């Protein structure tokens, strides 16, 4: 059966239609083990109050839309509790659940490719050795691209999709944990993903482990009034969040 | 002929095995 | 001591040999190896995951994304043809594909292969395509009847959405070459309309189908060699 | 084990059983790829297959025979000078360890996110005679991790290697070749990275942040000579006892700069391996 | 004889290899080895003994001894700050220390560390400092409150005299580099007044505190390399 | 043993247990360092620790991997002459065995008072061609303890080595490398000394009184040649099967003279590694 | 086994028994060769034989001692240039693997239709000095199967061999010699063929259709030099672990072209080994 | 390590040696070896199959086929002679023969040999030849009587058709040289009429006999060497 | 002395045997 | 492979062991 | 050390024995 | 390692023993 129910905090999400769910690398997210660990302090593990279902800012799906991404450790730099614990601690570790909702009617035609990606080192739009800037790979709930315009003075990434922004023919992207949203069967997309990184707990600020991409493959096509807007809404849930290396507090940027 | 790690360290050895 | 005879090959160097060499910094207890979700052990694995196919391998399209979609159209005529590509897995449009990209690292390939297609159409929309695998022997078929005569699969677009077409392994030589070779010609696969694309009122009349190719447990490669699909007409800076 | 390992029949592929026709309900050929999963359909499913006992090993399709092959990753060069010997930054080389500085191999790895392995090395000095006689020319290849005295010039005091590694090769003796663990520090080598040096809107960001396994300095001992020379001590690298986690799409566009992913020619409107077709209708 | 193949590495020389070589003067029965009180077997041992810290790492002070004392003063204000140093054990003032001096012989370090402070004050004198370890992540704290927020220890000067502050190991990478590296930044430690320095009549009002650093059983190093802290811009004569 | 020794897990460090809070009397964080002893406080004591099973070996932190590494301790040089062959004190070298004559390594030891070990050696002749052809050049490195005929010049009679050791190396053949016991005489090598030759207010005093393990004389056989040369037979030394008693503070100031401890530049108001800070308040 | 194998007495021939006279019906000497079969008549049948215990082995008459012998199959040549180094198609060779390009050996095989075997190789660089000094000249022999970047010129990027085989030989070190399986693809090497590329009345037809085991590219590293040279790295090939099916008549006429069977001189009205007799009556 | 002594022969290369050499592409599982009807294992086999003999080793005949037939004629006289060839298996007409062609690959030969003759005459035709083997010692016989004195076989042409003549092994040296040598002279074989060739009416009066030579289980060769019967006064092109 | 396939692969070995 | 003190004297041997 | 006919053939071997 | 008189004759051998 397609219907699905998910409960994460004080929050629950439902979906009367779906394309299974996917567990990234077939591993379920959980808490760190005293074997692979390294740190020495007792991690704070906000349960529920933290690893709950936060929903971001919504977006429009255009016939001119090109694609939009959000970087996870970062998308919730504001989402209460989790996103505070982030700033108060050096080491942060956590896994997520991605609920991608995008409905329209059975008279619509469209296809969205959704994918998560471990270490998504983007490329700059400008030739050289200048790497994308911080402040631009750190958008927030809002995400990046859309098909937007911007200063070329900024050590700005590639707004370039087909190359995967990293310069790998998108389409091989299917190698990363993914699924689509074929408006003719689908309604959502559900990605669940453990913590992948050569280190037991990284810097929630300097390093974004997971990177999520949603890309219109077959362009939205209705025959309706363009009064009919078909958003795309992303919801996320830290899972098995664990923090440590308590202290002052970083600063917003 | 084999398993004669002529050298002490493990980093020095043939291409591993398969299983 | 041991009366020894130094053999011809002695003192050489091979970029392909299994021999030990002294450490460099003894007693180095490397960082432990923590647990990490998702580790590979065989190319194969990567080869069994369907990657998308550039097929709309046409002009301006090519540097864009569209280069991936195949719109199923009108068709005034009937029993008309959609597209074709040839099976020789190292041949654009194929090549670039996670598989192709790879295979191009080995000299020989073998086994069955899997082509999957998906309807990015509508819900209320309907269609029926006929896909076919025309083994090596003749020319890519000009007509459907001619092609329907060999290996194929009628595809009924419906509540499902994905039809997967298998490409049996037909060959003389247990093995085929990855490199373009008239001999090791794997054949062609093509797609045609069985019926049409009917859409009730106020639904678009063109729609797309995405296509993919993953391997079969049949599959296997050999004789590693350096790739085709990448010329570093560099160098590389700093 | 032997036979299986000598005959190289460790990882064998299944055979293709026999089939019969099916005028039945469940349609295996129909799945919804949107689930992001991969189909599971086979020959036997789609056709009326026969019976072929296979015998192909997926041995050579192992991250160790895919990776475990020596590759030029650097070509140290020394256009000697006899005029000024020593002097600052002369007649002794110092290159930053880590690939990128070389294609082919770089592309191979990059096929995966993370990775880990003991590295086997091999040197290949090539003494080009620009004189009427070279003779005996000793060489000193001395590795140097981070925070370490890197020779200002040839004869520093760092070439004493009281606690460093220096391999010596004298014209005649075979090609030096040593190994090396998994160095790094944590768990595995970052095949990429989506982190930075810091919050400094001028900080570094890329797979050059998690990899700084010091530098290696060369230097041709023997001192001053009459007839000149020029050396080119090639470098090959092999990965033995390798591991892999999570894969990723290959690199179709010719790289740019060292570190970094950047794609972006000097106009070359950019370029990829894909070829153009007149029509989809004929291949 | 034995058909042998001479392997690539053969004939080389490595300043780091374990191989036998013929004696030079056979049958030499070396002088017996008498018993000698105190023999080492591991650098570690030396690393666990607290050596004094130059911290008064200031101008004219530096070539003298004072360069070791930290006088606890007046302080008109309250809740004021004493000093700070950063933890990266290869960073003057640290470096020179029996530990530092050492660590600078290896490429990587790890574990906890111990800082100890002693009151060379008076007997009738009293005070209460707050010491803190500000893990890597932000900037050395400008204020006490801000620093008190992380790892710390309030120190009550009394009949005891020595307070030992531990520096837990907080890091992402099981291991840190000994060499200056923005990544492997261990953080800062600082000291402030909790109360004051009160002295009854006719006692001086400034006094010193000595500080030290020894290792923790946590501790461990690796990848030997030649030191930093010593350039022989000699030579050396006769 | 193997695994533990191959895996290098011989000397492992304890793990960091878990803690809870303590609102209790005995304060482990308080000790009086004046006792000259060292504190014993740990993570688990001071904080609310977790549980980390360790896996770091203190193998490489052993007087044998700290000491057991080859280091240049001498660079014998011979600017040949063909004009006068033989002559007195020519075309044959004679250097006094013992370090000091070289840094890096010297500093390492000096970390301890006494010491003892079998010494492994390695030569590295480097024939610089100052002619249009060198060819075959035999070499004779002959060691010589005390009270022994030290060659006045090349061809003495002491180069017969009827009862001495002379190692021979001919251009082509690999690098000679031999070993050597613990020589000395009593128990261990004096890493220092606070004694003198005698009461003579002109007697010697230093670690040059207890160490006079004779000298080593070189000499390039082959005789007279046409095209000149100059040789530089490097020297490396490694300590295998080493021991150690009582440690001491490292040497921060650049040495002076051979033997001796002396510090004292030609003005260099003297200099040490310590860096200067503006203020203690900010690091 | 040993004795039999060391003494080489594995395949022994029968002995010649003793006979007596036969004034009998069945005539073994009479058979009809039209049956296409071969007669079975022996000494003992035809004459009054004696008794000879034999002792001749047919060991050396085995497809492995008939085939298993090294033979020149190619002579790679490089008339270096220093004027233009690199340039396109220079100072680096690339010959098509497979025999024919050499007689003797070619003729041997051809004795059979099919065949199969692991091939053992051996190189034999020969550096001819056209200068007053060559010195050190490194070499790189890198094999390359089909669909593979064949170097356009010397220093391509294909000489990195990140995943290819390149053997290196430096003047002094012995002759490189490696092996190699049975490559091909199906079952055995086509010692001939009666097939074509296709129906194209312009398609290829011959034992060059089933054998395209890529090419092997040479290249002399070391870079630019003063005194010139010319190299000739010979090639020998040996068949170890060989097999054979179905035999056929040897080749009497001197071959033509590579691949192909063609016979046909530039007039030489054609020529074969047969000699002419004046008369059959006297030999 | 192992005090070893490098022996004289060391480093050489022999086109005739059994030694191992490192693979080149590890883990290569070669194509399986399917079953194939007719595989050899010993030259011998080929040596035991009778191949046809060029004997009409005469002038214009030679480049043609006839060069293989021997017509049995008229013969006005009686007891006349047919032909002769010498046994030294490396001597045209012999040489070129599957055997000869071969033997010329080895330095020494031995054992018995088999000569077979067939009557391509008629059915109603009749004849009786006398074949003989004249061992080494004297001159090829001028007359039949003289030759009949040694080894021979009378051949009655009849319903059978093939007479096989054996050539015993007569020699001093267990072994003979394959190369022309006065010593190792194997002798001559010749054929003569015993009666005639009688043919009843209206049948041709000349007819042919084909002749062949296969080996005997006696047979065996040794000391491989490169052939005689083929000079590649080429090269060979492309 | 024998059967000491010093090398892993089978393609590398001496001339086979006879039987 | 080990403990094969190819040489007589003890002074000649590998780096000692650990215990 | 002996009887280690490193080579296959018998013709290749040391000087025979005595008896 | 020892007593492996790689050579036949006795005159060829290491320095004798002691007893
Ligand atoms: C990102 O993963 C890597 C990739 C390459 C690498 N290298 C391997 C070669 N190595 C090396 C090779 C030769 C000589 C010396 C001193 C070092 C340096 C580290 N280390 N980590
Ligand atoms: C103070 O301790 C030492 C320090 C060095 C030393 N050396 C070691 C090297 N050695 C040596 C090295 C090479 C050649 C010869 C003849 C001797 C002389 C003694 N002896 N004792
Ligand atoms: C038709 O049968 C053959 C005959 C020869 C052959 N060769 C053997 C030699 N080989 C080879 C020899 C040396 C170097 C390299 C790269 C390859 C190529 C294939 N392969 N198949």
Interface subset of I 1-19, CB within 8 angstroms of K: 1, 14
Residues 6+ positions from D68 with CB-CB distance below 8 Å = B15, D238, D239, D240, D242
Residue whose entry in the numeric block shows the structure tokens 């060691």 = F143
Ligand 2, residues F175, F180, F210: which to mutate, most atoms within 8 A of Cβ?
F180
Task: Compute the C-alpha angle A112/A118/A121, nearest 5°.
Answer: 95
Cα distances (angstroms) measured from residue H216 to each of E226, G41, G247, H85, K3? 81, 8, 19, 19, 39
Q: Total structural domains in chain G?
A: 1
Report the residue of H23, H27, H30 to disrupt the I interface, i.e. the one with the largest count of I CBs within 10 Å. Answer: H23
Name the nearest CA neighbour of H116 among H154, H165, H76.
H165
Please give the distance, rounded to the nearest whole angstrom, from the Cα atom of residue G216 to the centre of ligand 1. Answer: 29
Span from the CA of G97 to the centroid of ligand 3 (angstroms): 5
Q: Which positions in chain K touch E3 (Cβ < 8 Å)?
A: 6
How many CB atoms within 10 Å of residue B3?
7
E168 touches chain F (CB under 8 A): yes
Find the CATH number of the domain harbouring H144.
Answer: 2.60.120.20
Distance CA F117, CA F226 (A): 44
Distance from the J9 Cα atom to the nearest Cα atom in chain F, whole angstroms: 9
Ligand 3 pocket check: which of G100, G237, G241 to mutate, most ligand atoms within 8 Å of Cβ? G237
- Would you say the CB of residue F121 lies under 6 angstroms from ligand 2? yes
Query: Across the interface, do I15 and G59 touch by the CB < 8 Å criterion?
Result: no
* CB H196, CB H75: distance < 8 Å: yes
Is C26's CB within 8 Å of E18's CB? yes
Q: Which atom of ligand 1 has the smallest separation from the CA of D191?
A: 1
Q: Are F248 and F194 in contact (CB under 8 A)?
A: no
Least CB–CB distance from D223: residue in F70, F102, F230: F230
- The residue of chain I with its CA nearest to that of D2 is I8
Minimal C-alpha gap between E7 and chain K (Å)? 20
CATH number, domain of A198, equals 2.60.120.20
**Residue bearing the CA closest to ligand 1, atom 2:** D189
Q: For chain H, how many structural domains are there in total?
A: 1
Domain that includes residue G273, residue range: 1-283
User: Please, are residues A123 and A154 in contact by the beta-carbon 8 Å criterion?
Assistant: no
Partner residue opposite C24 with nearest CB, options D179, D245, D279? D179
Which of I11, I13, I19 to probe by mutation at the H interface, max H CB count within 10 Å? I11
Q: Which residues of E164-198 are buried (b: 16+ CB within 10 A; e: fewer)?
A: bbbbbbbbbbbbbbbbebebbbbbbbbbbbbebbe
Instruction: State if residue F144 touches ligand 2 by the CB under 6 angstroms criterion.
Output: no
- Can chain G be said to touch chain H, i.e. do they have 3 or more Cβ pairs within 8 angstroms? yes
Evaluate the omega torsion of the peptide bond into residue C235 and state whether it is cis, within 30 degrees of 0. Answer: yes
* Whether the CB of D237 sits within 6 Å of ligand 1: yes
Interface K:D, ≥3 CB–CB pairs < 8 Å: no
Peptide bond into E93 cis (omega under 30): yes
**How far does residue F238's CA lie from ligand 2's centre (Å)?**
10
D65 contacts in chain B (CB < 8 Å): 15
Q: Would you tell me which residues 7-66 of chain E have a C-beta closer than 8 angstroms to some C-beta of chain J?
A: 18-23, 26-28, 30
- Work out whether strand A188-193 and strand A22-23 pair parallel, antiparallel, or are unpaired: parallel
Q: Report which of E115, E130, E32 is spatially closest to residue E79, judged by C-alpha positions.
A: E130
3-state helix/strand/coil string of chain F: CHHHHHCCCCCECCCECCCCCCCCCCCCCECCHHHCCCCCCCHHHHCCECCECCCCECCCCEHHHHHCCCEEEEEEEEECCCCCCCCCCCCCCEEECCCCCCCCHHHHHCCECCCCCEEEEEEECCEEECCCCCCCCEEEEEEECCCCCCCCCCCCCCCCCCCCCEEEEEECECCCCCCCCCCCCCCCCCCCCCCECCCCCCCCECCCCCCCCCEEECCCCCCCCCCCEEEEEEEEEEEECCCECCECCCCCCCCCCCCCCCCCCCCCCCCCCCCCECCCCCC
Alpha-carbon distance of A184 to C124, in angstroms, equals: 8
Cα C18 to ligand 3 centroid, rounded to whole Å: 23
State the Cα angle at F221 between F216 and F226, rounded to 5°. 135
What three-state secondary structure class fits E5? coil
Q: Is the CB of G213 under 6 A from ligand 3?
A: yes
Domain that holds residue E38: 1-238
Chain D residues with CB under 8 Å of I8 CB are 5-6
Nominal resolution (angstroms): 3.8
User: Which residue of chain J has the CA closest to F239?
Assistant: J15
Q: How far is the CA of D159 from the centre of ligand 2 (A)?
A: 19
E20 to H1: CB separation less than 8 angstroms, yes or no: yes
**How far, rounded to the nearest angstrom, does the alpha carbon of residue E59 sit from its chain's CA centroid?**
21
Neighbors of chain I by Cβ distance (3+ pairs < 8 Å): B, D, G, H, K
What are H164's strand-pairing partners?
A: H116
DSSP at H68? G
CA-nearest residue, atom 17 of ligand 2: F97
Distance of alpha carbon G155 from alpha carbon G153, whole angstroms: 6
Query: Is there an atom of ligand 3 within 6 Å of G99 CB?
Result: yes
Query: F168 near F188, Cβ under 8 Å?
Result: no
> Which of C42, C112, C220 lies closest to D56 in CB terms?
C220
**Touching G: H residues 63-102, CB under 8 Å:** 63, 67, 70, 81-86, 91-93, 95-96, 98, 101-102
Whole-angstrom Cα distance, residue F25 to residue F36?
A: 24
Residue nearest to atom 5 of ligand 1 (CA): D98
G59 contacts in chain I (CB < 8 Å) = 18
Find residue D142's DSSP bridge partners: D166, D217
User: DSSP characters for chain G?
Assistant: -HHHHHTT-SSBPP-B--------S--TTB--GGGS------HHHHS----B----B-STTBHHHHH-S-EEEEEEEEE--SSSSS-TT-S--EEE-SSSSSTTHHHHHTTBS----EEEEEEE--EEE-SS-----EEEEEEE-SSS---SSSSSSTTS-TTS-EEEEEBTB----------SSSSS--S----BS-SSTT--BSTTSS----EEE---TT---SS-EEEEEEEEEEEES--B--B-----S---SSSS-----SSS----SPPPBS-TT--
CA–CA dist E126, E134 (Å, integer): 26
SS3 D235: strand
Q: Given an 8 Å threshold on Cβ–Cβ distance, is E8 in contact with C9?
A: no
Q: Which conformational region is residue E104 in: left (phi greater than 0), alpha (psi within -120 to 50 degrees), or beta?
A: alpha
Pairing of strands G215-217, G94-96: antiparallel
Q: Is D8 within 8 Å of H28 when comparing Cβ atoms? A: yes
In whole angstroms, give the CA distance from residue G47 to residue H153.
10
**CB within 8 Å: E1 and C6:** no
Closest-CA distance of chain H to residue E22, Å: 9
F98 ligand 2 Cβ < 6 A: yes
């Amino acid at each position: 059966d397609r219907i699905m129910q998910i409960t994460r905090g004080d929050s629950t999400i439902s979906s009367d239609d779906v394309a299974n769910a996917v567990v990234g690398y077939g591993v379920w997210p959980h808490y760190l083990t005293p074997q692979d660990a390294t740190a020495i302090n007792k991690p704070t593990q906000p349960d529920t109050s933290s690893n709950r279902f936060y929903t971001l800012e919504s977006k429009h799906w255009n016939g001119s839309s090109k694609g939009w991404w959000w970087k996870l450790p970062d998308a919730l730099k504001d989402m209460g509790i989790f996103g505070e614990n982030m700033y108060y601690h050096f080491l942060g570790r956590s896994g997520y659940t991605v609920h991608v909702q995008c409905n329209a009617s059975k008279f619509h035609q469209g296809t969205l490719l959704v994918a998560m990606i471990p270490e998504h080192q983007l490329a700059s739009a400008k030739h050289g050795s200048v790497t994308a800037g911080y402040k631009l790979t750190h958008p927030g709930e809002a995400g990046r691209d859309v098909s937007q315009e911007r200063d070329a003075s900024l050590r700005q990434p590639s707004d370039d999709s087909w190359l995967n922004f990293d310069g790998t023919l998108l389409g091989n992207l299917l190698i990363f944990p993914h699924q689509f949203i074929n408006l003719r069967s689908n309604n959502s997309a559900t990605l669940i993903v453990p913590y992948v990184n050569a280190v037991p707990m990284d810097s929630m600020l300097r390093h974004n482990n997971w990177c999520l991409v949603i890309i219109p493959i077959s362009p939205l096509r209705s025959e309706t009034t363009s009064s009919n807007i078909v958003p795309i809404t992303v919801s996320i849930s830290p899972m098995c969040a664990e923090f440590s290396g308590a202290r002052a507090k970083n600063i917003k940027q | 002929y084999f398993n004669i790690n002529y050298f002490k360290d493990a980093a020095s050895s043939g291409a591993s095995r398969l299983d | 001591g041991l009366p020894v005879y130094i053999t011809p090959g002695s003192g050489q160097f091979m970029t392909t040999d299994d021999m030990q060499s002294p450490c460099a910094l003894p007693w180095y207890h490397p960082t432990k190896e923590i647990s990490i979700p998702g580790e590979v052990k065989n190319l194969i694995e990567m080869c069994q995951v369907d990657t998308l196919i550039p097929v709309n391998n046409v002009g301006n399209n090519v540097g864009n994304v569209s280069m991936y979609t195949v719109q199923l159209g009108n068709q005034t005529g009937m029993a008309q043809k959609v597209f074709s590509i040839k099976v020789d897995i190292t041949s654009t449009p194929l090549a670039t594909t996670l598989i192709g990209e790879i295979a191009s690292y080995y000299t020989h390939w073998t086994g069955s292969l899997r082509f999957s297609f998906m309807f990015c159409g509508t819900a209320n929309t309907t269609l029926k395509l006929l896909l076919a695998y025309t083994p090596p022997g003749i020319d890519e078929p000009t007509t459907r009847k001619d092609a329907m005569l060999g290996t194929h699969v009628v595809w009924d677009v419906g509540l499902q959405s994905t039809i997967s077409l298998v490409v049996p392994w037909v060959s003389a030589s247990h093995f085929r070459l990855t490199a373009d070779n008239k001999y090791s010609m794997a054949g062609y696969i093509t797609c045609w309309y069985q019926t049409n694309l009917v859409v009730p009122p106020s639904t678009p009349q063109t729609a797309d189908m995405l296509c993919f190719v993953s391997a079969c447990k049949d599959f296997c490669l050999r004789m590693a060699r350096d790739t085709d699909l990448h010329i570093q007409s560099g160098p590389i800076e700093q | 084990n032997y036979i299986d390992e000598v005959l190289n029949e460790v990882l064998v592929v299944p055979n293709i059983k026999e089939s019969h026709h099916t005028t039945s309900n469940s349609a295996p050929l129909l799945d919804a790829a949107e689930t992001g999963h991969t189909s599971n359909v086979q020959p036997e499913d789609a056709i009326e297959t026969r019976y072929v006992i296979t015998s192909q090993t997926r041995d050579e399709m192992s991250i160790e025979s895919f990776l475990g092959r020596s590759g030029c990753v650097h070509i140290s060069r020394i256009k000697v000078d006899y005029t000024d010997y020593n002097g600052q930054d002369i007649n002794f080389t110092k290159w930053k360890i880590t690939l990128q500085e070389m294609a082919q191999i770089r592309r191979k790895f990059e096929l995966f996110t993370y990775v880990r392995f003991d590295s086997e090395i091999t040197l290949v000095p090539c003494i080009a005679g620009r004189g009427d006689d070279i003779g005996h020319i000793v060489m000193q290849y001395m590795y140097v991790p981070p925070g370490a005295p890197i020779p200002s010039k040839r004869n520093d005091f760092s070439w004493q290697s009281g606690t460093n590694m220096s391999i010596f090769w004298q014209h005649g003796q075979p090609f030096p070749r040593f190994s090396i663990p998994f160095l790094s520090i944590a768990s595995a080598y970052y095949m990429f990275y989506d982190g930075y040096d810091g919050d400094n809107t001028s900080s570094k960001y890329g797979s050059v942040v998690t990899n700084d396994m010091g530098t290696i300095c060369s230097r041709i001992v023997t001192e001053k000579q009459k007839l000149s020379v020029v050396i080119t001590t090639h470098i090959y690298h092999k990965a033995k006892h390798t591991k892999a986690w999570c894969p990723r799409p290959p690199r179709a566009v010719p790289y740019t700069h060292s570190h970094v992913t950047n794609y972006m020619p000097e106009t070359g409107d950019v370029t990829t391996a894909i070829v153009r077709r007149n029509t989809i209708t004929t291949a």
